[PDB]
């Protein structure tokens, strides 16, 4: 998955990972990545996008990223 392909296309990348954002009864997030090619791709300069960087930091195999520079009232009812 480079910049060219879409989300669901056939990709040379092996895994975005075993992933399940749905909460599951306790320890609510999923099991994380399978491994050993994730470090190769992030080593090779393949970029992460914003939330995979948050998820990789949150799993603690990478350090986390601070998101907010300022606060203005976000609307939670947009959905």
Residues that bind RNA (CB under 7 A): 2-10, 12, 43-47, 49-52, 68-72, 74-75, 78-79
Residues 11-40, one symbol each (x = binds other proteins by CB under 8 A, - = not), give -------x--xxxxxxxxxxxxxx------
| Cβ at position 1, least distance to other proteins in Å | 18
Nearer residue to RNA within complex by CB, 26 or 75? 75
| Cβ at position 40, least distance to RNA in Å | 8
| Cβ at position 36, least distance to RNA in Å | 15
Query: Euclidean distance between the first and final Cα of the chain, in Å?
Result: 29
Query: 56 with 50: CB under 8 angstroms?
Result: no
CA distance 28 to 35: 21
Return the DSSP state at 73. -
CA distance 55 to 17: 11
């Amino acid at each position: 998955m480079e910049k060219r392909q879409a989300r669901n296309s056939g990709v040379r990348k092996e895994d975005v990972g075993w992933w399940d954002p749905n909460p599951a009864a306790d320890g609510n997030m999923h099991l994380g990545l399978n491994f050993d090619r994730l470090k190769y791709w992030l080593t090779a300069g393949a970029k992460p996008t914003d939330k995979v960087a948050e998820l990789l930091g949150h799993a603690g195999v990478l350090p986390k990223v601070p998101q907010p520079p300022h606060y203005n009232p976000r609307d939670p009812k947009d959905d």
